[PDB]
């Protein structure tokens, strides 16, 4: 008998949570970077074929890059919102930028 050289050490990995990417906030790639497992294109089609809309929701939104973000209900935009810089005796709130007209536009 003969023992082959290639062995199964660098083959397993497990991730509960951890590092992300800065652009997408998705789990980073990596065997030794403690990185995520890819639910590819064909597995998206396999999760629709079962009719499991929540396993698709879990494997592609709820456990990858779920962010609760702010949206203006006037211009309909993600990126024009801002949380204001208030008085230290007040509370900040979330406000759109292009829906907001500046205070040197008083008209009468």
């Amino acid at each position: 008998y003969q023992r082959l050289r290639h062995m199964v050490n660098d083959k397993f990995q497990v991730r509960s949570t951890g590092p992300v990417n800065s652009l997408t906030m998705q789990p980073v790639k990596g065997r030794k970077r403690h990185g995520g497992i890819r639910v590819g294109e064909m597995e998206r089609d396999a999760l629709i074929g079962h009719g499991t809309s929540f396993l698709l929701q879990d494997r592609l939104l709820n456990s990858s890059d779920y962010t609760q973000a702010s949206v203006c209900r006037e211009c309909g935009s993600i990126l024009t919102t801002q949380q204001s810089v208030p008085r230290i005796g007040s509370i900040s709130t979330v406000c759109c930028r292009r829906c907001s007209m500046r205070f040197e536009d008083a008209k009468k």
Partner: protein, 1465 residues
């Protein structure tokens, strides 16, 4: 996600648009400084990394006031000093430039011609299409009182049309855009932009504007004009330089004020309810916007920080924003400065082109361009949509190599403790799980049934890793203590417990071809193990072998996803595959070969053995029993010693796992093992279950393998999927423990023939020493047994060697005569002449059971290897006529051609060792040509058929709402439920068990019982009376009952094919069960086998073609086969098939001799085919005379081979041939510049000759054999000026072009073997117009082609649709692969949904409603431009559009809402 943080507001639709120059209100930063760092590395204010674009480098943000942890980032704008355009919209502003006229400031088209397209496109932004074709019905130096009266008439027609449709329910205020309305809109806009293309002068003023020219998307030229055309514009409206790109604005900004009426409907596909103006500064960019700081972080590799790629080609715009800014100050004080100013406008365009694209800005053109720009970030296989929206990387997942295990359940997975103390689940703590969750916090992150974090009611996490048991018992006793807040009195805590035995796991082998390769397992945490560990019954569905394969383990994170992976995606509901309804799960190798031993007739067991085998497989503590106490049976031998039987153990384990209050199973099946293998009079091939007792027959792969109609597949039908999954576990432990107590081995003596049988193969193989010569002398047509060394034989065999056709005949004759000798040895020796026989011979027991192997493998071990065949031919042979250096040249021997008479038991000789290495490499080289075959076929199907689902009205619709079918497969039956549908005798034997499954007691109050049964008997009576009629004389008084009544609500509304087979069963069988209660059972079984609404039948159909196409990838065992044929049908929608054919049924009175004469009347006959020689005697002297003499064959020969008369040759040679010959001679000179003895023509020959000298150029003589049709003769004369001319090579090219007789588009018509009585003729080529005229031989009503687009052009769209289901079926039937027709009907109805024959490609995708499907498939920014110019509202209903925006999918569990019924007012 948290489930304690609900979101109230959700996104319903996405509008596309253009940001205008009100960026100033949005961004108040105005990034001017091109320098991005400084010394000390700080961000310089005004630069790209300014601190009002987000926090950066541990600074607080200027506008957000927050650190990097909480700022979103903010957008900054770059002021562009000129309107540089947009390279997205450039090809479209280049069309509205080349269509206007600079003088009249209108288009160069008549203002009623433009008005008609605006009048129609207003109609098509509502849903009404017939009205848009009823506007060309409206017509009347035309004076302007007529045309403006015409425009009053057309516009009044639209106002009446829309107000009529909107008063009805045909449209809404926001239009009625659908896919067929998208078709007619994209046909007008392509037309409207084509009649704005080639119209010369402004038809409203007369004078015309010049032509424009461009380069690769940077320059705008205004070309000159030839002198015939300048004078036309001075007599009218007086009674190649570069254009600066702020003037192309002022062209277009004066046009769009005048042409706002027509452009209001070209740029809006639904009505512009905001009625804002299409402005021409939507094409031009006065400002850029800069993405925020978070989206522009610096890159780094190794440890070396770089500058961001997005900033390298953006400060380059910001230097040229400053280069042109100082250079503008030289204009402020006032040649060469304009040569630098115009140089700046090119690069400020060629840099803003580089920020957006990378091939649209060519620049230096030095190859391998870096900084790929914001388009190449969106478009590739990687891109952004495919790599990061359609697929993602996930949290709470794992992967490992898999290992086998017969000791876990078939629905389970064996999780290592390495994985088990890492993956966690956020369990909310309540009053019923506080006992479990206290101990989980106490055990902590290291002991396995433990926890790792608790989450308080303010969302803050408390880790448990550093703590002792005292801090952990502190936290564990505070899980139900209410925090005294008021904001969070609703919430409770969450323990993140480890993964326990009750959890669920999605496992997938990674090439995920079909949905059974991603199933839901139950967790079983096994100590001391480091790999994932799986049962053998799961290896068929994953295509898994345990040799270094890995599988991913996904752990879902809420109770909605636990409930789907336990009820929809579990392994118990994946027992039958959706491809053809066959079972895919069953025991595999040793368990097959143990059931042939355990259920045998020698198997006797005593009481201590019997009771140990029952408890070895069935534990009541693990919940296997249905009784809580193991019940047993009396022995089958009482007196001499009490003994049980091995079949009686199979009976007992079915007694303990099947539910007690049902009757037993009743099944008459077969084995794979013949009765002759057991001795005289045995009946051990019939398998008999009677009331759950195995009374006869052994059990095989045919019973508990992955095989249809066995015992395991029968228990699945009668008792359900949970019981049939438990029987696969109980049997798998039974045969594992029986193998350990009683092993199975294969040795050397299993391979041996007995001394008599070893003489039998000697005597038969002595009769193949002469087979190679007798096959040789048959092929070379030599008689009376010429010897092998005969010199006239060796001359002929060399002649066979030089031709590939002739060598294929010698191979195929000899391969038939040695495979006769082969199969006599296997017949004589394999069961009957072996030393050890079947119930002791394990090499036979493994092959006969289906455990492992075949009888082909057994025969090559024990008898002989036989003929080695290399791509359908025999062993290759050198130039010298040798097949090896060992052999004589032209050795007529079976061994010399590779017929191995050796066997693997006794070893093979070195000559036949070398030929067997040739056959071993021919399979391995075919895999070497098999790199990427079917991966893109399935992607194209699944992208179109993504959202196709079953609706609640049983129609098959797409996600936008468009209907595809009216009922699934014609009958609305799930393929995975129809397996025992027409197994009526099985359902009659199991009537009482099938009755209480399909329980009709508490079922008749909810569904109609009489209305469908009455209407079916009226249609069944009406359909027998008119069954004799053809399909076009069928009367249509009664449509099918499924069209009239809902199958799921009306009992007896049944497909007419199930109704026939059921009524055919009841009358041909006279058998305490009536027929009237066997109708009602099977009609209820129809009603409970329906497809469910929300089923993803479009994915399943694409996976039922894309998965068995991977099986379909091999060589020839003519017509296109396999994947290259399937890519012609499904992809590309080819109207040009490689091998178009036509199948012609012949009548029943026409004979074979009449039909072979008929095939000759069609097939094309070249003049080359009837010519024996052409002898050319060139002579020079006197003009170069060329005497062309043709020898034909004998006249009886070619008339009886090609149906060609000698008078047809005359009218081809004189009329057609010589015109081609002289056309080739003059052409060849044009490049040169740059026996018998006969006489005595009669009058008519002398007159025919002078008729030909007039019509041609260089002929001067002609003759023909008018008497026998044997020779032709004509004697050209060219000049003396020309030198040598290869006349023979010219004649050969002309003869191989000249047709004597060809009906067009048809080459060959052949008469094949009549397969199943259809006497047909197959035609190489398609022309239905011509076979209609042949009606006295051919039944023209049944002529069938494989060309779909030919049938679509001639016979219509329903005939083209029946072609596609017959062609895709023939692709799979030639591989013995069976796909259901319910899949093929859905593919063919999706291709013919527009009346035409569309493909599953980019152009077939074009006429569809969802843009995010289109952007995510391919050419991402190409479809994006088409949607921005169209102001399209993405309605977010295709599954690709819902994953982009994160909305819940609309297929399966998302096709309905759930609402909680609250009790108080």
């Amino acid at each position: 996600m948290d489930i304690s943080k609900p979101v109230g507001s959700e996104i319903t639709s996405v509008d596309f648009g253009i940001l205008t120059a009100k960026i100033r209100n949005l961004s108040a930063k105005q990034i001017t400084n091109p320098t991005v760092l400084d010394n000390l590395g700080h961000p310089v204010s005004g630069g790209l990394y300014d601190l009002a674009l987000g926090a950066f480098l541990r600074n607080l943000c200027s506008t957000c006031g927050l650190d990097e942890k909480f700022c979103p980032g903010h957008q900054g704008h770059i002021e562009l000093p000129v309107p540089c355009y947009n390279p997205l919209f450039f090809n479209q502003l280049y069309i509205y430039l080349r269509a206007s006229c600079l003088f009249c400031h209108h288009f160069r088209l008549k203002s009623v011609e433009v008005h008609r397209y605006a009048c129609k496109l207003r109609l098509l932004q509502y849903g009404l299409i017939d009205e848009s074709y009823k506007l060309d019905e409206i017509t009347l130096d035309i004076s302007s009182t007529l045309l403006n009266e015409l425009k009053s008439k057309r516009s009044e027609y639209v106002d009446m049309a829309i107000a009529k449709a909107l008063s009805d329910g045909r449209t809404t205020e926001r239009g009625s855009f659908t896919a067929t309305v998208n078709d007619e809109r994209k046909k007008l806009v392509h037309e409207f932009h084509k009649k704005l293309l080639s119209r010369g002068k402004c038809d409203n003023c007369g004078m015309f504007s010049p032509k424009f020219r461009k380069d690769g998307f940077t320059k705008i030229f205004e070309t000159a004009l030839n002198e015939k055309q300048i004078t036309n514009n001075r007599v009218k409206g007086f009674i190649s330089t570069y254009i600066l790109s702020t003037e192309v604005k002022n062209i277009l900004d004066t046009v769009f004020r005048k042409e706002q009426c027509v452009l209001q409907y070209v740029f809006h596909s639904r009505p512009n309810l905001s009625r804002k103006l299409v402005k021409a500064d939507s094409f031009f960019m006065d400002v850029l916007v800069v993405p925020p700081t978070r989206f522009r972080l610096p890159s780094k590799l190794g440890e070396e920080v770089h500058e961001n790629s997005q900033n390298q080609l953006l400060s380059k715009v910001l230097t040229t924003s400053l280069l042109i800014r100082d250079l503008n100050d030289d204009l402020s004080k006032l040649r060469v400065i304009f040569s630098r100013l115009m140089n700046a406008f090119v690069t400020i365009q060629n840099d803003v082109n580089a920020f957006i694209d990378s091939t649209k800005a060519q620049g230096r053109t030095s190859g391998k361009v870096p900084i790929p720009g914001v388009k190449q970030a969106l478009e590739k296989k990687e891109g952004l949509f495919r790599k990061h929206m359609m697929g993602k990387r996930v949290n709470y997942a794992a992967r490992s190599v898999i290992s086998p295990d017969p000791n876990i359940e078939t629905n389970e997975i064996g999780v290592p403790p390495v994985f088990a103390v890492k993956l966690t689940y956020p369990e909310p703590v309540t009053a019923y799980n506080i006992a479990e969750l206290r101990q989980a916090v106490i055990n902590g992150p290291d002991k396995w049934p433990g926890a790792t974090q608790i989450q308080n009611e303010d969302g803050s996490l408390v880790s448990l890793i550093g703590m002792s048991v005292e801090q952990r018992k502190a936290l564990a006793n505070q899980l139900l203590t209410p925090s005294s807040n008021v904001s969070t009195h609703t919430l409770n805590k969450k323990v993140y417990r480890h993964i326990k035995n009750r959890d669920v796991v999605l496992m997938n082998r990674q090439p995920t071809l079909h949905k059974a390769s991603m199933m839901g397992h139950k967790v079983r945490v096994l100590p001391n193990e480091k790999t994932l560990r799986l049962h053998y019954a799961n290896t068929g569905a994953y295509n898994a072998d345990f040799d270094g394969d890995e599988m991913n383990m996904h752990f879902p994170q809420n109770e909605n996803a636990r409930a789907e992976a336990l009820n929809l995606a579990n392994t118990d509901s994946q027992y039958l595959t959706p491809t053809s309804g066959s079972p895919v799960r069953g025991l595999i190798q040793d368990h097959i070969s143990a059931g042939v031993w355990l259920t045998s007739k020698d198997s006797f067991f005593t009481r201590e053995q019997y009771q140990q085998y029952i408890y070895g497989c069935i534990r009541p503590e693990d919940g296997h029993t249905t009784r809580s106490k193991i019940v047993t049976l009396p022995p089958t031998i009482f007196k001499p010693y009490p003994l049980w039987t091995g079949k009686q153990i199979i009976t007992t384990v079915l007694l303990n796992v099947t539910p007690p209050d049902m009757p037993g199973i009743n099944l008459i099946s077969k084995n794979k093992i013949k009765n002759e293998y057991w001795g005289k009079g045995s009946l051990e091939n019939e398998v008999l279950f009677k009331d759950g007792a195995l009374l006869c027959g052994i059990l095989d792969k045919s019973q508990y393998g992955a095989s249809k109609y066995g015992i395991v597949h029968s228990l699945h039908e009668v008792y359900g999927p949970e019981v049939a999954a438990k029987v696969l576990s109980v049997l798998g432990r039974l045969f594992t423990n029986y193998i350990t107590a009683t092993a199975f081995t294969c040795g050397m003596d299993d391979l041996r023939l007995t001394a008599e049988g070893n003489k039998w193969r000697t005597d038969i193989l002595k009769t193949s020493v002469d087979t190679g010569r007798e096959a040789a002398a048959e092929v070379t047509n030599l008689d009376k047994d010429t010897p092998a060394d005969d010199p006239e034989l060796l001359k002929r065999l060399q002649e066979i060697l030089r031709d590939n056709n002739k060598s294929g005949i010698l191979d195929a004759v000899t391969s038939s005569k040695v495979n006769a000798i082969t199969s006599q040895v296997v017949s004589k020796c394999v069961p009957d002449g072996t030393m050890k026989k079947f119930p002791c011979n394990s090499m036979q027991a493994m092959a006969l059971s289906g455990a492992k192997g075949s009888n082909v493998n057994v025969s090559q071990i024990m008898c002989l290897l036989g003929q080695q065949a290399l791509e359908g031919r025999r062993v290759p042979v050198m130039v010298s006529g040798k097949t090896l250096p060992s052999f004589k040249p032209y050795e007529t021997d079976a061994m010399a051609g590779g017929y191995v008479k050796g066997r693997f038991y006794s070893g093979i000789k070195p000559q036949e060792y070398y030929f067997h290495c040739m056959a071993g490499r021919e399979g391995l080289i075919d895999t070497a040509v098999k790199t990427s075959r079917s991966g893109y076929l399935q992607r194209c199907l699944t992208k179109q058929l993504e959202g196709v689902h079953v609706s609640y009205d049983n129609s098959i619709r797409d996600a936008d709402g468009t209907l595809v079918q009216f009922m699934y497969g014609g009958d609305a039956i799930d393929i995975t439920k129809e397996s025992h549908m027409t197994q009526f005798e099985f359902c009659l034997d199991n009537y009482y068990a099938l009755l209480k499954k399909y329980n009709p007691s508490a079922l008749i109050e909810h569904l109609d019982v009489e209305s469908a049964l009455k209407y079916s008997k009226k249609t069944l009576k009406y359909r027998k009376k008119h069954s004799k009629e053809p399909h076009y004389k069928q009367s249509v008084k009664y449509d099918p009952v499924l069209a009239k009544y809902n199958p799921a609500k009306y009992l007896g509304s049944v497909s007419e094919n199930f109704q026939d087979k059921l009524e055919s069963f009841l009358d041909k069988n006279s058998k305490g069960v009536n027929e009237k209660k066997f109708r009602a059972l099977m009609q209820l079984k129809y009603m409970r086998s329906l497809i469910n609404p929300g089923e993803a039948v479009g994915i399943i159909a694409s996976q039922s073609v894309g998965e068995p196409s991977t099986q379909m990838t091999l060589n020839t065992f003519n017509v296109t086969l396999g994947i290259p044929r399937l890519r012609e049908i499904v992809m590309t929608a080819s109207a040009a098939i490689k091998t178009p054919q036509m199948t012609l049924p012949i009548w029943n009175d026409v004979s074979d001799e009449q039909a072979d004469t008929f095939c000759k009347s069609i097939s094309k006959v070249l003049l080359s085919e009837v010519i024996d020689k052409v002898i050319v005697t060139e002579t020079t002297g006197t003009a170069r005379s060329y005497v062309i003499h043709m020898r034909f064959f004998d006249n009886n020969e070619y008339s009886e081979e090609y149906d060609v008369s000698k008078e047809e040759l005359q009218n081809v040679i004189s009329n057609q041939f010589i015109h081609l010959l002289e056309a080739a001679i003059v052409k060849e000179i044009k490049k040169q510049k740059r026996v018998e003895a006969n006489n005595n023509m009669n009058k008519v020959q002398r007159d025919r000759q002078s008729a030909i000298i007039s019509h041609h150029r260089f002929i001067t003589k002609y003759n023909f054999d008018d008497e026998s049709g044997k020779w032709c003769e004509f004697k050209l004369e060219l000049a003396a000026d020309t030198e040598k001319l290869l006349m023979v090579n010219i004649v050969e090219e002309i003869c191989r072009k000249s047709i004597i007789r060809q009906i067009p588009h048809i080459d060959r018509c052949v008469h094949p073997e009549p397969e199943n009585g259809k006497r047909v003729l197959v035609t190489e080529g398609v022309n239905f117009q011509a076979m209609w005229d042949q009606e006295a031989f051919i039944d023209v009503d049944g002529i069938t082609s494989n060309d779909v687009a030919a049938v679509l052009k001639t016979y219509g769209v329903e005939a083209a649709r029946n072609t596609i289901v017959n062609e895709i079926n023939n692709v799979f039937s030639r591989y013995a692969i069976s796909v259901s027709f319910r899949h093929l009907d859905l593919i063919a109805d999706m291709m013919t949904r527009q009346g035409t024959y569309l493909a599953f490609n980019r152009q077939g995708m074009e006429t569809s409603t969802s843009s995010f499907m289109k952007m995510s498939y391919e050419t991402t920014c190409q479809f994006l431009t088409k949607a921005v110019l169209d102001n399209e509202r993405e309605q977010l209903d295709s599954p690709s559009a819902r994953i982009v925006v994160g909305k819940l999918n609309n297929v399966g569990t998302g096709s309905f809402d759930v609402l909680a019924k609250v009790p108080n007012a």
